[PDB]
């Protein structure tokens, strides 16, 4: 059925846009439904890449601590993890430190990571400058993108970047 | 080995249902399960009823140790700035009763199988459980989360499309529920009769405190009060107020509550039909 199978993880604070990002990738829709994800949810998307057919098993996680033990199972065995923050939410940016630690703790040592600043359409409410995020990401050898789930900006590129990077790790 | 069939009982409560299922899955030789006849919407109502019974029991016995003379829950220590604006459709109200917060942060939406967001208390809640990991609150939330996970694992298994799959995670979710129920039922057993107040969802809010609220805070209160079967003194106080109603109206006519799922159009209608009633 496929040449490859990449388990992907979406992690990051509650309400920063993880479920929205995953909905823009899988179905190209956007909705404002105030519904919090419980534990985990997943989607499946087969993509063709450099001639090879790749299955993406993408896991949407919950960001709140009571669900931490439930999501942690999925860090091991993950080929790539996307750490998401909200560009209008300094706290959720600060917490990326704490998320990178959960990746250490539970994920393999070779996982591909991606930093992603969401809600970048809120331009007058942005409190996390691109440079401060970029510099942090660069210090780690970690790619970084500013996405908008709402206006479909870089959402495709984030998952396709990450699939490309994992494929390159062969 | 024959995989057992999870079935939902004639009117049996969530705990009995789980006890039943854990028994069927603990039987010898079983290595899969049939979740085909499980109605996830009914499973959610079933868990929500139980949560409601627990949250009600916590309030009656005042497991929160709330002093009569405070108008605030015990989360206040873990939250400023205390923005008065809406956060994913709710505004922080310091006057929320603990059992309402508990219900909010743990009720499974029968339609979507997620939680209807209650963002202003997610961080104070988490912060509380960190300083007080053995607190009654932490135990209730833990039983709550445990019940959610049972439904989660079943919905996962009920799907199909994956590697394999596979069960021990379900088995554990069931046993973790039982355990946490033991501790919850034990807390509850210790028994000062029940103390009542003069609105359903919030501790008493005085006129001066209430005239300091933003429109978003006020609308949050109104939307909450409509969950009650009878008009409240609090919501009447707000709608009766001309000045307060102004703030309520231009928040209702905002965008901060667009995404709400608690029948937001219909509630907005009730609120308007109630202002007219009252002026
Ligand atoms: N302006 C803007 N708001 C967003 C964006 N993505 C998500 N949101 C908002 O934040 C909420 C979605 O976050 P969500 O993914 O559902 O929560 P999570 O699963 O816990 O990350 C929505 O209800 C939106 O109001 C975005 O790209 N732009
Ligand atoms: Mg989520």
Curated annotation (Swiss-Prot), chain A:
Q: Which GO terms describe its molecular function?
A: cadherin binding; G protein activity; GTP binding; GTPase activity
Specify the domain of life of the species encoding this protein: Eukaryota
Q: Which UniProt keywords apply?
A: Acetylation, Autophagy, Cytoplasm, Endoplasmic reticulum, Endosome, ER-Golgi transport, Glycoprotein, Golgi apparatus, GTP-binding, Hydrolase, Isopeptide bond, Lipoprotein, Magnesium, Membrane, Metal-binding, Nucleotide-binding, Phosphoprotein, Prenylation, Protein transport, Transport, Ubl conjugation
Give me the residues that bind Mg(2+), please.
Answer: 19, 37, 60
Q: Which GO terms describe its biological process?
A: autophagosome assembly; autophagy; cell migration; COPII-coated vesicle cargo loading; defense response to bacterium; endocytosis; endoplasmic reticulum to Golgi vesicle-mediated transport; Golgi organization
| Top EC category | hydrolase
Description of activity control: Regulated by guanine nucleotide exchange factors (GEFs) which promote the exchange of bound GDP for free GTP. Regulated by GTPase activating proteins (GAPs) which increase the GTP hydrolysis activity. Inhibited by GDP dissociation inhibitors (GDIs).
What is the reaction catalyzed?
GTP + H2O = GDP + phosphate + H(+)
Q: Where is this cross-link: Glycyl lysine isopeptide (Lys-Gly) (interchain with G-Cter in ubiquitin)?
A: 43, 55
Give the E.C. number(s). 3.6.5.2
Post-translational modification here is noted as: Phosphorylated by CDK1 kinase during mitosis. (Microbial infection) Phosphocholinated at Ser-73 by L.pneumophila AnkX, leading to displace GDP dissociation inhibitors (GDI). Both GDP-bound and GTP-bound forms can be phosphocholinated. Dephosphocholinated by L.pneumophila Lem3, restoring accessibility to L.pneumophila GTPase effector LepB.
Entry-listed glycosylation sites = 66, 68, 76, 105
- Residue positions annotated to bind GTP are 14-15, 17-20, 32, 37, 63, 118-119, 121, 149-150
Query: (Microbial infection) O-(2-cholinephosphoryl)serine-modified residues are where?
Result: 73
Entry's Gene Ontology cellular component terms: cytosol; early endosome; endomembrane system; endoplasmic reticulum; extracellular exosome; Golgi apparatus; Golgi membrane; melanosome
Family from the record: Belongs to the small GTPase superfamily. Rab family.
Write out the function statement from the record.
Answer: The small GTPases Rab are key regulators of intracellular membrane trafficking, from the formation of transport vesicles to their fusion with membranes. Rabs cycle between an inactive GDP-bound form and an active GTP-bound form that is able to recruit to membranes different sets of downstream effectors directly responsible for vesicle formation, movement, tethering and fusion. RAB1A regulates vesicular protein transport from the endoplasmic reticulum (ER) to the Golgi compartment and on to the cell surface, and plays a role in IL-8 and growth hormone secretion.
Subunit: May interact with YIPF5. Interacts with C9orf72; the interaction mediates recruitment of RAB1A to the ATG1/ULK1 kinase complex. Interacts with GDI1; this promotes dissociation from membranes.
Domain remarks in the entry?
Switch 1, switch 2 and the interswitch regions are characteristic of Rab GTPases and mediate the interactions with Rab downstream effectors. The switch regions undergo conformational changes upon nucleotide binding which drive interaction with specific sets of effector proteins, with most effectors only binding to GTP-bound Rab.
State the name under which the record lists this protein.
Ras-related protein Rab-1A
Q: Which organism is it from?
A: Homo sapiens
What range of the full-length protein does this chain span? 7 to 176 of 205
């Amino acid at each position: 059925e496929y040449d490859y199978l990449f388990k992907l993880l979406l992690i990051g604070d509650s309400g920063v846009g993880k479920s929205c990002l995953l909905l823009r990738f899988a179905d190209d829709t956007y909705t404002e439904s105030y519904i919090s994800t419980i534990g985990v949810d997943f989607k499946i998307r087969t993509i063709e890449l450099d001639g090879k057919t790749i299955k993406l098993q993408i896991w949407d996680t919950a960001g709140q601590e009571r669900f931490r033990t439930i999501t942690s199972s999925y860090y091991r065995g993950a080929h790539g993890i996307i750490v998401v923050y909200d560009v209008t939410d300094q706290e959720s940016f600060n917490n990326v430190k704490q998320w990178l630690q959960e990746i250490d703790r539970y994920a393999s040592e070779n996982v591909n990571k991606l930093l992603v600043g969401n809600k970048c359409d809120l331009t007058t409410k942005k409190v996390v400058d691109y440079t401060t995020a970029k510099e942090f990401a660069d210090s780690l050898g970690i790619p970084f993108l500013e996405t908008s789930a709402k206006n479909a900006t870089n959402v495709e590129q984030s998952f396709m970047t990450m699939a490309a990077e994992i494929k390159k790790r062969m | 080995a024959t995989p057992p069939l999870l079935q939902m009982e004639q009117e049996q409560p969530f705990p009995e249902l789980i006890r039943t299922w854990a028994g069927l899955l603990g039987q010898i030789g079983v290595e899969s399960v049939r979740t085909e006849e499980v109605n996830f919407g009914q499973l959610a109502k079933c868990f929500n009823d139980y949560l409601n019974t627990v949250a009600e029991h916590c309030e009656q016995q005042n497991i929160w140790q709330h002093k009569r003379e405070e108008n605030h829950n015990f989360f206040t220590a873990f939250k400023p700035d205390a923005s008065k604006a809406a956060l994913h459709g709710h505004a922080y109200i310091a006057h929320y009763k603990e059992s309402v917060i508990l219900r909010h942060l743990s009720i499974v939406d029968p339609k979507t199988l997620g939680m209807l967001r209650f963002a202003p208390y997610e961080a104070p809640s988490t912060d509380y459980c960190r300083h007080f990991p053995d607190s009654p609150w932490a135990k209730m939330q833990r039983l709550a989360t445990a019940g959610q996970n049972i439904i989660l694992q079943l919905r996962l298994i009920q799907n199909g499309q994956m590697l394999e799959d596979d069960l021990p995670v379900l088995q554990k979710a069931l046993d973790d529920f039982m355990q946490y129920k033991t501790e919850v039922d034990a807390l509850l057993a210790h028994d000062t009769p029940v103390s009542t107040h003069d609105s359903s969802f919030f501790y008493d809010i005085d006129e001066q405190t209430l005239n300091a609220m933003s429109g978003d805070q006020l609308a949050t209160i109104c939307f909450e009060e409509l969950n009650a079967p009878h008009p409240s003194r609090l919501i009447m106080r707000i709608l009766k107020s001309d000045s307060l109603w102004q703030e309520v109206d231009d928040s209702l006519n905002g965008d901060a509550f667009m995404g709400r799922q608690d029948d937001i159009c219909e509630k907005r209608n009730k609120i308007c039909q109630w202002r007219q009633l009252v002026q």
